[PDB]
């Protein structure tokens, strides 16, 4: 019961010690550093914290780095503002020049290559969009008639709706970044601005240089990478879902169709999916979010979303902790209230149908159907948890896991509460190791079910492969069991037939050493029996059976060792009897 | 295709002539009177304007009247505004008085018996909230602790989180209210403050006075509304959600789990349901809407709803028809995008199953599985409209009915476009004027499949109980038909076998006298055989059957009739061939 | 409830004018003339015999003409008698010759070009089989070691393991013998030894010269047949599957899978099937059927027959009525207990879905599901109630049929019982009549339901596309219904409060004026009320709303008009009031 996961970014008013427990208290998962901003030295002072803090506190967060990525820009402004009215003309050089309400230049000399006449140019976040009207390569200048009016300061952003984009996968600077995150072990890269598949690899090539063993996460922020979706997510290991980004080069009365499809695209291929920007702004400035907000939250929760990110909120907001405390308020309210029975079925038909996801599938309907207390998911690389994860099953997913590593992966996948233990290498461990993990996180007890499952022999373990049902211990007394049923219920120990007279309502399991005559009258107003000795034809056995109440016989010094009071349930077929409630 | 219905709130930026033009054009369905303002005379100009501007377009729009309902208020203040300290006392005496930072007047004379102690009391759409210390009865006075602060104008609000808020159902305006709506034949009442089934039959009593024939929807504000959300639509024609006027009472963590709900509890009853308030607020000062609020909207749809309200975005915004427009896009990008095989089974499972419901069921499968271009649906009620909406298929319905009136009421009900042909007695009469008025409305042509349905008889109609499935006519040529298929393809009229030699791709119908030895080669390469005459065990007949092409023998002259080269559907069971495509 | 048609062979024990009346009355449906034996003056004598007792007692009986069809047949042996040593040789020559346990002759002389090398060729229903050893076209002789030994007669039958047997489609004879059917109203022609599409159509352009109008059910007996299926079932109206006759040429151990895929590939098309031969063989000589035999029958009804057939045991048996009133026994208990909710679910998924079979769908989940009594087909052709019978539903079909020749061609169709009722040409007329017919049939009372289908308008019906849902008559008072609900249940009419004081029970339906303060306490101990005048917010709705209980209120004169003590059913939609039970 916590299962959508939350990503916070760090920044002024979250670096402190103090705050970062804050947040982790609070329910942080992941912590993102945007290195659009910032210098290394910040960053790793940041990472230090963190570290530390997470360690202090014995909890897993990982460390997501979000690249700047590339970009368009103006170039400087002549006084530093310039105006344009609404119904003119502006050029936009590709040559550096000074700005006017004329000529105007930006950075990606390369713009007019990838527009065409007619092709909008949308110019500070889309303050104010522009048109293509003429294009001359002669000058390289693409003539444009300005269709909003308003201002324009100097080193402000450039965007062109889809248009394929030709700027490379990651700057310099990026592949600055990204080294400097091989050197900490940072757990995800979030990369800006992909696009094509080839703008993933450029990474990956540069993490396989270090074999480094980070998930690289790409932000899908225009339509190139909407259409190219499928052939990206092939390539990467999750995603994330940049609205705001989003917003300015597709219209905000289709964003959402998008998100829906693409958190829908990501559950797929089990991949997991973050939500991000314009989550709970208005918690910069306020100690609540807007019902606008809860509600956007909560839809990306219903979308199918693995996490959920926070950007000023907690990065420079006056309200830091209060924004993180009221995202899991949403998240667990929007999860309360959700049909598990309509998401595995629905997952059952999203998802492929495969040997690689066989056990996925069993596991989701066993865990819904025996109603499961917790699925403990043993995995050395995250695979089998996020098999298990994407068919979303009400019940808690424990990683245990011996890569600390791969269990800050763990920390971003839906639902999975991750753990570290110390590798187990036959599969008689493993079991053993994951019933013994599962109660120790307090979580599951004695009357509880667990599934367990991994892919078996830890070695060729390409694929999660078994699952085993576990009843968590171990029966209180056992015998020869009459009957097939079972019932909860509390004893209440007999040395003589009076010593149930006038005393006796139903809904208790008697326990004597034989039935006489005299006994008979009173087992058939009772829940269930467990008798001393006897055989298969006793006569505690006989009355049992006809009187349809799940008995036990055979049962060692059932009088004396098992308790007066206590409640206790009694499993006819298997002939054992348990602590409290079982299964 | 258009689907979820439009509700503009028409006022000061909307009333001309001119403007509900461009509304009306923009997408509007309903247009809504605000009577919580404005006087009975600006009302009627209205009422008028819309009517003509209204039947000059030939459009079908309604009018809602928005009763104001009760309310507690603040009296007068000192000064006209005073302050409250964050950890103070107030008192809220039910005798009239100045205001102070003391005491401080209300007037609602019955709060105090409606609160206890420790029951929340919100000031001004929940601006600062106080809470209940002590109740004493003697000085009639609620002693309370001020939780937040902040400043408190004269005649503002007061709100009692439930708490069976003890007002009446109506006010004594209320009553002037809707017997002037009785008056103008106004479509639908929209009744505030609804709580208890009482609430809405006081309106009903009042209607059923003039037999007035209105539709009354209640607004759902509080906690006593929502819990008795059953009890209420049990005796309502349809709902509203106001999330803003919600929200204050009910924490905004909390309003979209509702809003889930009670739509889907509409959903579940057939009664149309439209979602209020706080939809595209931003487009009251800007002329594009935000991310946030396009995914609210389309969330709003996705959640069920029939109708979608617009407020001040019509009424007294900068951009009305931007706002309508905008709406309408939203709303068909999010229905472009969802899964009606999903949707229809989901329907089919939530509303019950009944002799009553038992003809919206077959046809909704029907409609998607032979996918039907339009179920046309005649009502006299509008019952069978909503019967069939409540399915919620691909397939326009469209709504053939005698009543003007009716025709308006079903103008809010989700996915119907209602005409207005006049009444047929006999059942042939309905059937035949359906499928006319079908096709007079462009949206079906001859190719086209079509679900007819009504209550019939027509008299004794009390519910919706048949079909007829139906092709849009109308056989070109027939005769005797070889095989059970069928193919759209081109055709190509042969007089010789040296008629089809060396110009042949397959993908075309022949169609020549009969068939020799000479026409066997060619028959087999092609996609279907017409023949002139001939009989059942004829040459042309024998090869069609043997080479499995679909063949009809025994047609009229068909070399000289039916045209060469004109795309054309044969349908071998039947023995029937079409003009285009087919089914 | 009567379901499985029974097809009986009149002969010598059955011709009389007294037992054909015992036959009707014990359950026929049609009856079989053998023309493998018997000369047409015989079978003449039958059928003027038939149609006049048939037509005294009132009731539909088709007649059904088995032709003898081709067969290959040993020419006379020396001595009359001939015997086969268990390893030796014998010449099967295709010359005409005496017979010997060396040379031997058979009619077929083309057989040497069906068989060769190993082939399997049986003597006399598969007494003695041989085994091809060389074959010599230059004498046109076939060596062959004989098997098995035994005893040969001498115009004893052969058979040929198919081996595609080239004998023609018809005998001379056979023509002969179907020219007779077409001069007699014959209803049904069973063509034998059917095993290509040609050996139908031979029979069908016979047909097609008299424009006869008779239904031909092909026999298959050999794996050609049983090869060819598909083929030959699109050119024909039924199936007659001769288990005797395919016993002989195909394993024993086998024929059982085939009858089983041959029934379920009829059941597909809609096309009914005849189960034949073998079926009660003991009845022949005892006046009761073995166990296996009532096995063997039951299955039949299982596999999803359409008809069981009967031989010898009416033909030339000693207990001629006695097997008849056996077969409905069986066919009755099997039908008992068989599941017609899997059986639909299964017909659902095994025939297609189309636009010709959308109504088929529709009725059946239609009137499973709502519990409809009867499903009126009005049919020109059959092919109505030849769609609606498909989908196997529990309600009794009945055919309202204009035509008295296609109301005998559905005697023999699962399901259906026929009525000939004069033709309406009006959908209103359609409608109305069958409301009329389906209550004079004595099976449908007043407060059950009906599904009335059929093709429309009556003209251009091709196929079935129209379902109405109609409640059998007849509201006996009406009124302002208040609830939704509904309750069957006994009236008290009550004057005063004290008119129901020391005297109930629940379950009581109370009939008053109004509601007082002293009624109140009474009605919530009611099942439901009929008040007589009021309006929806009276003390008797608002009373009824309140406590659950369905009512109508605004019931003209209610107290005197609707009796005391009578069962009635109110329904609270709709605001009827009904005679007995309802829906
Ligand atoms: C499933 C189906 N119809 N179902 C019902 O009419 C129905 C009525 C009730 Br009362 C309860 C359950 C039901 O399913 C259907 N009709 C089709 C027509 C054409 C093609 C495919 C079709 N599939």
């Not at 990982?62 to 502006?90: F, S």
């Not at 693409?142 to 201002?151: A, F, P, Q, Y």
């Not at 979580?443 to 968590?472: C, S």
Request: charged share 25%; net charge negative.
């Amino acid at each position: 019961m916590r299962k959508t996961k939350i990503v916070c970014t760090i920044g002024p008013a979250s670096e402190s010690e103090e705050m970062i427990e804050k947040l982790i208290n609070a329910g942080m998962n992941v912590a993102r550093l945007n290195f659009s901003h910032g210098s290394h030295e910040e960053h790793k002072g940041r990472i230090d914290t963190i570290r530390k803090v997470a360690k202090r506190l014995d909890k897993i967060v990982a460390i997501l780095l979000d690249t700047k990525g590339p970009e368009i820009r103006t170039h400087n402004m002549k006084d530093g503002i310039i105006e344009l009215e609404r119904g003119n003309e502006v050029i936009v050089s590709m040559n550096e020049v000074e700005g006017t309400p004329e000529k105007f230049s930006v950075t990606y000399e390369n713009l007019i290559n990838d527009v065409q006449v007619g092709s909008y140019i949308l110019l500070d976040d889309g303050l104010i969009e522009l048109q293509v009207k003429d294009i001359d390569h002669a000058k390289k200048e693409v003539k444009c008639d300005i269709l909003n009016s308003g201002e324009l300061k100097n080193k402000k952003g450039v965007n062109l709706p889809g248009v394929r984009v030709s700027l490379p996968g990651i700057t310099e600077k990026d592949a600055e970044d990204i080294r400097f995150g091989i050197k900490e072990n940072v757990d995800f890269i979030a990369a800006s601005f992909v696009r094509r598949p080839s703008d993933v690899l450029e990474i990956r090539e540069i993490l396989e240089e270090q074999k480094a063993n980070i998930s690289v996460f790409p932000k899908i922020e225009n339509q190139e990478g909407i259409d190219n979706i499928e052939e990206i997510l092939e390539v990467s290991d999750g995603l994330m879902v940049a609205r705001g980004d989003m917003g300015v080069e597709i219209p905000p009365e289709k964003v959402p169709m998008v998100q829906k499809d693409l958190i829908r695209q990501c559950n797929k291929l089990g991949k997991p999916v973050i939500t991000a920007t314009q989550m709970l702004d208005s918690m910069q400035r306020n100690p609540r979010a807007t019902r606008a907000e809860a509600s956007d939250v909560a839809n990306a929760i219903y979308d199918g979303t693995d996490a959920v990110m926070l950007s000023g909120e907690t990065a420079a907001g006056l309200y830091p902790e209060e924004a993180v405390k009221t995202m899991r308020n949403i998240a667990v309210s929007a999860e309360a209230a959700q049909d598990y029975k309509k998401l595995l079925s629905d997952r059952t038909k999203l998802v492929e149908t495969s040997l690689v996801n066989a056990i996925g599938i069993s596991v989701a309907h066993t865990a819904l159907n025996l109603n499961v207390k917790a699925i403990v998911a043993a995995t050395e690389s995250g695979s089998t948890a996020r098999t298990i994860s994407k068919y979303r099953p009400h019940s808690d997913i424990i990683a245990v896991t011996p890569s600390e590593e791969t269990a800050r992966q763990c920390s971003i996948v839906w639902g999975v509460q991750p753990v570290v233990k110390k590798g187990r290498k036959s599969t008689d461990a493993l079991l053993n190791n994951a019933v013994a993990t599962a109660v120790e996180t307090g979580r599951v007890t004695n009357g509880d079910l667990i599934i367990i499952t991994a892919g078996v022999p830890t070695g060729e373990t390409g694929t999660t492969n078994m699952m085993k049902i576990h009843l968590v211990g171990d029966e209180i007394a056992n015998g020869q069991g009459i009957g097939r049923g079972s019932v909860v219920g509390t004893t209440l120990v007999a040395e003589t037939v009076k010593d149930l007279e006038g005393k006796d309502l139903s809904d208790k399991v008697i326990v004597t050493n034989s039935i006489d005559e005299t006994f008979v009258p009173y087992v058939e107003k009772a829940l269930g029996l467990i008798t001393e000795e006897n055989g298969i034809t006793s006569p505690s056995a006989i009355v049992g059976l006809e009187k349809g109440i799940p008995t036990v016989v055979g049962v060692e010094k059932a009088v004396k060792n098992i308790s007066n009071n206590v409640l206790v349930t009694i499993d006819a077929a298997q002939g054992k009897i348990f602590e409290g409630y079982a299964n």
